[PDB]
Amino acid sequence: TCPFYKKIPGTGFTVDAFQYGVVEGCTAYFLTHFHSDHYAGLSKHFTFPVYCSEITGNLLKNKLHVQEQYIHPLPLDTECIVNGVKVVLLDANHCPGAVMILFYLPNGTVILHTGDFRADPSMERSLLADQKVHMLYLDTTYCSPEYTFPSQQEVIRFAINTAFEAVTLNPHALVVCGTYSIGKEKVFLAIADVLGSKVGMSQEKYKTLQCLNIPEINSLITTDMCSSLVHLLPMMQINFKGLQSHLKKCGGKYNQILAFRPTGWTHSNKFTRIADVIPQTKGNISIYGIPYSEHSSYLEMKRFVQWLKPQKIIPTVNVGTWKSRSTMEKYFREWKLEAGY
Ligand code: NI
């Protein structure tokens, strides 16, 4: 049965609620982005209307085989009527195709559902500036002050410099990057660009990337492993065993692997600077864990919420324990008392 935080009061709408069967009263199912916890339950046998971005729509059709007739893509930054309710989709600065959804209820209440997001100051000059928000359905993944990590720009700078240095010293070194979902494409694309290479990957991952509307993508990726010195592999293969096995497969073309594991937050963040990160090494294999986040840091989240000044906050992440829920409620009250709303 569908939890309260996936229901939109005063509508027949749900958000990211496809694993509960037919939801009584739901006339339109919104999907914020193509991550499996959020789409869990959709398949080619779904027959209710699905509203989403163009990109999410490409992925539902090609990867999940949902039928065309039930896919409803909406452009971003555009007032749209759905089943007689005005809605707007906003870029969530998460993975490709990810949105936030603004709902303008028939009684005058305005609701923002963030989906998954990485808050940014640029959101303060979107259509959110223009009117008041009563209720906020908030991605609270990292809602605790221990959660620090650097900017995406700093992390990409570290990766580009690390890779270019290693391959310029040893032209026979291979770079490998792990992936298990869409998102974080900048990691492998920025590294391949500095090396003057395409990125090689499986047929299944190539297909996924072809759904994402990335400009000039045909110039950046390929299924021909041999021609490429940046390879993508499943995240589960990013360990000494998996990589050894992969190097065997390249037929004596390379004698060193340098590998990247983009993680979310890891406790090494509370002591160390990005500059000072060191790999795990065994032999001719080095693995770097880099903190490339597509969710808000605690400070970014706090800034956003203090700017928006919502009347009520409903968390959508970390909701399963009493201790989590109580901790999040304490920070919302500090923020409100500090800012005066
Ligand atoms: Ni996500």
Short mmCIF file of C-alpha atoms and ligand atoms in Angstrom, two decimals:
data_model
loop_
_atom_site.label_atom_id
_atom_site.label_comp_id
_atom_site.label_asym_id
_atom_site.label_seq_id
_atom_site.Cartn_x
_atom_site.Cartn_y
_atom_site.Cartn_z
CA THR A 1 0.00 0.00 0.00
CA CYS A 2 1.16 3.49 -1.07
CA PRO A 3 2.75 5.68 1.66
CA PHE A 4 1.39 9.18 2.38
CA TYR A 5 4.54 10.97 1.21
CA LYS A 6 3.94 9.67 -2.42
CA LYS A 7 0.42 11.10 -2.58
CA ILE A 8 -0.51 14.61 -3.74
CA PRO A 9 -3.55 15.88 -1.69
CA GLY A 10 -6.47 17.30 -3.66
CA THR A 11 -5.46 15.62 -6.86
CA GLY A 12 -5.74 12.19 -8.45
CA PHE A 13 -1.89 12.25 -8.69
CA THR A 14 1.00 10.14 -7.37
CA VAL A 15 4.79 10.57 -7.59
CA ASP A 16 7.22 7.62 -8.06
CA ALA A 17 4.54 5.06 -6.99
CA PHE A 18 4.63 2.18 -9.45
CA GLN A 19 5.23 -0.82 -7.06
CA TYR A 20 1.83 -0.82 -5.24
CA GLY A 21 -0.45 -2.09 -8.07
CA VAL A 22 -3.44 0.05 -9.09
CA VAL A 23 -3.59 2.95 -6.60
CA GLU A 24 -7.24 3.78 -5.80
CA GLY A 25 -8.06 7.23 -7.17
CA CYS A 26 -4.93 7.77 -9.26
CA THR A 27 -5.65 9.26 -12.70
CA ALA A 28 -1.97 10.20 -13.50
CA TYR A 29 1.32 8.62 -12.30
CA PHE A 30 4.32 11.00 -12.34
CA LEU A 31 7.89 9.67 -12.66
CA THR A 32 10.64 12.13 -11.46
CA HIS A 33 13.60 10.19 -13.02
CA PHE A 34 14.89 6.85 -14.32
CA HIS A 35 16.39 5.32 -11.13
CA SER A 36 15.23 1.84 -10.18
CA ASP A 37 14.01 2.60 -6.62
CA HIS A 38 11.71 5.23 -8.26
CA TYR A 39 10.46 3.36 -11.33
CA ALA A 40 10.22 -0.03 -9.41
CA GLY A 41 7.14 -1.70 -10.75
CA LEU A 42 6.85 -0.31 -14.33
CA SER A 43 7.04 -2.76 -17.27
CA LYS A 44 5.59 -3.23 -20.83
CA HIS A 45 2.19 -4.25 -19.27
CA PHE A 46 1.47 -0.84 -17.66
CA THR A 47 -1.77 0.79 -18.99
CA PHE A 48 -2.15 4.06 -16.93
CA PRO A 49 -0.87 7.46 -18.03
CA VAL A 50 2.77 8.27 -17.06
CA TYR A 51 3.95 11.85 -16.99
CA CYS A 52 7.67 12.66 -17.16
CA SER A 53 10.45 14.43 -19.01
CA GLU A 54 11.35 13.73 -22.71
CA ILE A 55 14.49 11.88 -21.58
CA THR A 56 12.73 9.69 -19.00
CA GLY A 57 10.18 8.93 -21.76
CA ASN A 58 12.96 7.71 -24.16
CA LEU A 59 14.22 5.36 -21.40
CA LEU A 60 10.71 3.98 -20.51
CA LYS A 61 10.00 3.19 -24.19
CA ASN A 62 13.49 1.70 -25.12
CA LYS A 63 14.67 0.10 -21.91
CA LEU A 64 11.46 -0.94 -20.10
CA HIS A 65 9.28 -1.28 -23.27
CA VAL A 66 6.35 0.68 -21.86
CA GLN A 67 3.93 1.34 -24.79
CA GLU A 68 4.00 4.67 -26.51
CA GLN A 69 0.34 5.44 -25.93
CA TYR A 70 0.88 5.60 -22.11
CA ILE A 71 4.05 7.81 -22.18
CA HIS A 72 3.31 11.58 -21.75
CA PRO A 73 6.51 13.71 -22.02
CA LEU A 74 6.35 17.40 -20.92
CA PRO A 75 8.85 20.15 -21.80
CA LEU A 76 10.61 21.88 -18.88
CA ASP A 77 9.96 25.46 -17.61
CA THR A 78 6.49 25.46 -19.20
CA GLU A 79 3.04 25.82 -17.64
CA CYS A 80 1.04 22.65 -18.63
CA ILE A 81 -2.52 21.43 -17.79
CA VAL A 82 -2.84 17.79 -16.71
CA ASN A 83 -6.32 16.42 -15.90
CA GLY A 84 -7.35 20.05 -15.19
CA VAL A 85 -4.44 20.93 -12.84
CA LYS A 86 -1.56 23.33 -13.83
CA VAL A 87 1.88 21.77 -13.40
CA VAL A 88 5.48 22.75 -14.27
CA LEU A 89 8.57 20.47 -14.58
CA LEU A 90 11.91 21.96 -13.43
CA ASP A 91 15.49 20.61 -13.87
CA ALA A 92 16.45 18.76 -10.64
CA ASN A 93 20.33 18.84 -11.21
CA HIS A 94 20.31 15.07 -10.51
CA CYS A 95 20.78 12.55 -13.46
CA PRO A 96 19.76 13.13 -17.10
CA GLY A 97 16.04 13.68 -17.44
CA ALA A 98 15.45 14.17 -13.66
CA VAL A 99 12.80 16.76 -12.64
CA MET A 100 11.13 18.52 -9.79
CA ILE A 101 7.37 19.02 -10.17
CA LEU A 102 5.40 22.18 -9.17
CA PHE A 103 1.67 21.51 -8.63
CA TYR A 104 -0.82 24.45 -8.56
CA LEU A 105 -3.84 22.90 -6.67
CA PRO A 106 -7.41 23.97 -7.52
CA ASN A 107 -7.85 25.39 -3.94
CA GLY A 108 -4.79 27.81 -4.33
CA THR A 109 -2.17 25.70 -2.49
CA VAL A 110 1.20 25.33 -4.30
CA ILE A 111 3.29 22.11 -3.75
CA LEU A 112 6.95 21.44 -4.83
CA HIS A 113 8.06 17.78 -5.09
CA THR A 114 11.86 17.77 -5.50
CA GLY A 115 12.24 14.15 -6.66
CA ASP A 116 15.98 13.48 -6.16
CA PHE A 117 17.93 16.76 -6.49
CA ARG A 118 21.21 18.53 -5.89
CA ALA A 119 20.16 22.03 -4.74
CA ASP A 120 21.84 24.92 -6.45
CA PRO A 121 21.68 28.76 -6.22
CA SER A 122 20.52 28.85 -9.85
CA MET A 123 17.18 27.37 -8.68
CA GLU A 124 16.52 30.68 -6.88
CA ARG A 125 16.01 32.24 -10.46
CA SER A 126 13.75 29.65 -11.93
CA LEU A 127 9.93 29.83 -11.89
CA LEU A 128 10.13 29.10 -8.17
CA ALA A 129 10.94 32.78 -7.50
CA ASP A 130 7.50 33.89 -8.76
CA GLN A 131 5.10 32.72 -5.97
CA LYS A 132 4.80 31.12 -2.60
CA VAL A 133 5.13 27.36 -1.83
CA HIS A 134 3.00 25.93 0.93
CA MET A 135 4.30 22.29 1.00
CA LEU A 136 7.73 20.84 0.08
CA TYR A 137 8.28 17.08 -0.57
CA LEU A 138 12.09 17.08 0.04
CA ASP A 139 15.02 14.76 -0.96
CA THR A 140 16.62 14.44 2.49
CA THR A 141 19.31 11.85 1.47
CA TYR A 142 22.13 13.90 3.14
CA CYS A 143 20.20 15.85 5.79
CA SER A 144 22.86 15.81 8.56
CA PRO A 145 25.79 18.19 8.97
CA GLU A 146 28.48 15.47 8.70
CA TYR A 147 27.57 15.25 4.99
CA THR A 148 30.09 17.40 3.23
CA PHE A 149 31.55 16.78 -0.26
CA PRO A 150 33.15 19.11 -2.90
CA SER A 151 31.62 20.64 -5.99
CA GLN A 152 31.18 18.55 -9.10
CA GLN A 153 33.62 20.92 -10.91
CA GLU A 154 36.42 20.16 -8.25
CA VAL A 155 35.88 16.42 -8.47
CA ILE A 156 36.05 16.46 -12.30
CA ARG A 157 39.25 18.55 -12.14
CA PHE A 158 40.88 15.90 -9.85
CA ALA A 159 39.84 13.06 -12.17
CA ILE A 160 40.99 14.77 -15.47
CA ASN A 161 44.44 15.65 -13.89
CA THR A 162 44.91 12.16 -12.32
CA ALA A 163 44.11 10.37 -15.60
CA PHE A 164 46.10 12.65 -17.96
CA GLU A 165 49.18 12.41 -15.66
CA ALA A 166 49.08 8.58 -15.51
CA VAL A 167 48.57 7.97 -19.19
CA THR A 168 51.21 10.59 -20.18
CA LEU A 169 53.72 8.74 -18.00
CA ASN A 170 52.59 5.32 -19.31
CA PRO A 171 50.90 5.29 -22.78
CA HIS A 172 50.13 1.61 -22.13
CA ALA A 173 47.83 2.37 -19.13
CA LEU A 174 44.02 1.77 -19.46
CA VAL A 175 41.44 3.86 -17.63
CA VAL A 176 38.28 2.05 -16.34
CA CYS A 177 35.18 3.81 -14.82
CA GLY A 178 32.33 1.98 -12.99
CA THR A 179 28.59 2.60 -13.60
CA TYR A 180 25.29 0.96 -12.36
CA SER A 181 22.62 3.47 -13.31
CA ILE A 182 22.27 6.63 -15.36
CA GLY A 183 23.89 9.73 -13.83
CA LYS A 184 27.51 10.87 -13.30
CA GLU A 185 28.27 10.66 -17.10
CA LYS A 186 30.60 13.72 -16.70
CA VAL A 187 33.20 11.50 -14.92
CA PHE A 188 33.91 9.22 -17.93
CA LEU A 189 33.18 11.87 -20.61
CA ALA A 190 35.62 14.45 -19.15
CA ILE A 191 38.38 11.84 -18.76
CA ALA A 192 37.94 10.56 -22.38
CA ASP A 193 37.96 14.12 -23.73
CA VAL A 194 41.35 14.94 -22.14
CA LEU A 195 42.79 11.66 -23.48
CA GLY A 196 41.51 12.17 -27.04
CA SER A 197 39.59 8.89 -26.92
CA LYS A 198 35.96 7.68 -27.24
CA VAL A 199 34.52 5.72 -24.34
CA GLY A 200 33.98 2.05 -24.92
CA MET A 201 31.19 0.06 -23.31
CA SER A 202 28.73 -2.75 -23.70
CA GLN A 203 25.86 -2.79 -26.15
CA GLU A 204 23.29 -2.42 -23.29
CA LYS A 205 25.04 0.68 -21.85
CA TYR A 206 25.50 2.22 -25.31
CA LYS A 207 21.72 1.86 -25.82
CA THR A 208 21.01 3.62 -22.50
CA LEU A 209 23.33 6.49 -23.38
CA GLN A 210 21.67 6.92 -26.80
CA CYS A 211 18.34 7.83 -24.92
CA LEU A 212 19.87 10.83 -23.12
CA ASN A 213 19.93 13.67 -25.76
CA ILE A 214 23.59 14.42 -25.08
CA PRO A 215 24.88 16.70 -27.87
CA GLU A 216 27.27 15.07 -30.36
CA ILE A 217 27.12 11.72 -28.48
CA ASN A 218 28.09 9.71 -31.57
CA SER A 219 31.47 11.51 -31.47
CA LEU A 220 32.04 10.50 -27.78
CA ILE A 221 31.08 6.80 -27.26
CA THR A 222 31.45 3.44 -28.97
CA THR A 223 30.92 -0.35 -28.67
CA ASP A 224 34.40 -1.04 -30.07
CA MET A 225 36.46 -1.74 -26.94
CA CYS A 226 39.71 -2.15 -28.83
CA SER A 227 39.78 1.33 -30.33
CA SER A 228 39.11 3.01 -26.93
CA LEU A 229 41.38 3.64 -23.92
CA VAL A 230 38.53 4.60 -21.49
CA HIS A 231 36.38 1.57 -20.72
CA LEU A 232 33.08 1.45 -18.76
CA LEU A 233 32.29 -1.57 -16.60
CA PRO A 234 29.59 -2.52 -14.15
CA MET A 235 30.30 -1.12 -10.71
CA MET A 236 30.48 -4.66 -9.30
CA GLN A 237 33.47 -5.45 -11.49
CA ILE A 238 35.46 -2.46 -9.94
CA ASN A 239 37.73 -4.53 -7.62
CA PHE A 240 41.18 -6.19 -8.04
CA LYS A 241 39.71 -9.56 -9.29
CA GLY A 242 37.31 -7.99 -11.77
CA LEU A 243 39.92 -5.66 -13.25
CA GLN A 244 42.68 -8.34 -13.56
CA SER A 245 40.18 -10.39 -15.45
CA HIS A 246 39.31 -7.42 -17.70
CA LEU A 247 43.03 -6.71 -18.52
CA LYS A 248 43.54 -10.35 -19.54
CA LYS A 249 40.73 -9.72 -22.11
CA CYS A 250 42.53 -6.81 -23.78
CA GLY A 251 45.14 -9.16 -25.33
CA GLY A 252 48.42 -7.60 -24.09
CA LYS A 253 47.44 -4.08 -25.28
CA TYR A 254 47.86 -2.60 -21.77
CA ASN A 255 50.00 -3.30 -18.66
CA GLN A 256 48.38 -1.01 -16.02
CA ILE A 257 44.78 -0.10 -15.03
CA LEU A 258 43.74 3.08 -13.36
CA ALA A 259 40.09 2.83 -12.23
CA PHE A 260 37.47 5.24 -10.85
CA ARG A 261 34.52 4.35 -8.52
CA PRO A 262 32.20 7.29 -8.23
CA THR A 263 30.57 6.84 -4.84
CA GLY A 264 28.12 8.96 -2.94
CA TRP A 265 29.41 10.16 0.42
CA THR A 266 31.97 8.01 2.28
CA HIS A 267 33.33 8.81 5.91
CA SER A 268 36.81 9.62 4.49
CA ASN A 269 35.04 13.01 3.58
CA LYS A 270 35.09 14.13 7.30
CA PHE A 271 38.95 14.17 7.52
CA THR A 272 40.45 14.46 4.05
CA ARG A 273 40.45 17.00 1.20
CA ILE A 274 39.77 15.94 -2.46
CA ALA A 275 43.36 17.03 -3.29
CA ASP A 276 44.75 14.49 -0.80
CA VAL A 277 42.76 11.36 -1.96
CA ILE A 278 44.81 8.22 -2.50
CA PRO A 279 43.99 4.99 -4.32
CA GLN A 280 43.91 1.37 -3.31
CA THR A 281 46.72 -0.45 -5.13
CA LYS A 282 47.58 -4.07 -5.85
CA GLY A 283 50.30 -4.60 -8.43
CA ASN A 284 49.66 -2.79 -11.75
CA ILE A 285 46.00 -1.92 -10.65
CA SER A 286 44.97 1.28 -8.79
CA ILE A 287 41.30 2.09 -7.74
CA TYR A 288 40.28 5.64 -6.82
CA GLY A 289 36.96 6.27 -4.96
CA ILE A 290 35.83 9.76 -5.84
CA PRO A 291 32.92 11.64 -4.08
CA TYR A 292 30.90 12.75 -7.11
CA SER A 293 27.41 13.48 -5.64
CA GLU A 294 24.10 14.05 -7.48
CA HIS A 295 22.27 14.84 -4.20
CA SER A 296 22.39 18.06 -2.06
CA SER A 297 25.05 18.41 0.66
CA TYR A 298 23.63 19.46 4.03
CA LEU A 299 24.67 23.13 3.46
CA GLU A 300 23.17 23.22 -0.10
CA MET A 301 19.84 21.74 1.21
CA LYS A 302 19.70 24.17 4.13
CA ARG A 303 20.33 27.13 1.81
CA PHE A 304 17.59 26.10 -0.59
CA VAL A 305 14.98 25.48 2.06
CA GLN A 306 15.80 28.78 3.97
CA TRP A 307 15.33 30.63 0.62
CA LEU A 308 12.06 28.86 -0.32
CA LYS A 309 10.52 29.26 3.20
CA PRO A 310 7.93 26.55 2.90
CA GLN A 311 5.02 26.23 5.43
CA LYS A 312 5.45 22.51 5.80
CA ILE A 313 8.27 20.00 4.90
CA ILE A 314 7.61 16.31 4.13
CA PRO A 315 10.82 14.21 3.84
CA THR A 316 10.98 11.52 1.15
CA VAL A 317 14.33 9.81 2.16
CA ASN A 318 15.45 8.30 5.53
CA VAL A 319 11.85 8.02 6.65
CA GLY A 320 11.94 4.44 7.94
CA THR A 321 13.25 5.01 11.54
CA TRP A 322 12.00 7.11 14.41
CA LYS A 323 15.49 8.41 15.14
CA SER A 324 15.95 9.55 11.46
CA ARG A 325 12.56 11.28 11.40
CA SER A 326 13.22 13.06 14.73
CA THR A 327 16.68 14.21 13.72
CA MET A 328 15.37 15.71 10.42
CA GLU A 329 12.51 17.52 12.28
CA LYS A 330 15.08 19.13 14.63
CA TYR A 331 17.11 20.55 11.74
CA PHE A 332 13.95 21.89 9.96
CA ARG A 333 13.08 23.80 13.21
CA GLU A 334 16.59 25.26 13.57
CA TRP A 335 16.52 26.42 10.00
CA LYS A 336 13.10 28.02 10.42
CA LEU A 337 14.07 29.74 13.74
CA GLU A 338 17.38 31.02 12.27
CA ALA A 339 15.76 32.44 9.12
CA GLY A 340 12.50 33.68 10.83
CA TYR A 341 9.74 32.12 8.72
NI NI B 1 17.98 9.07 -7.96
#
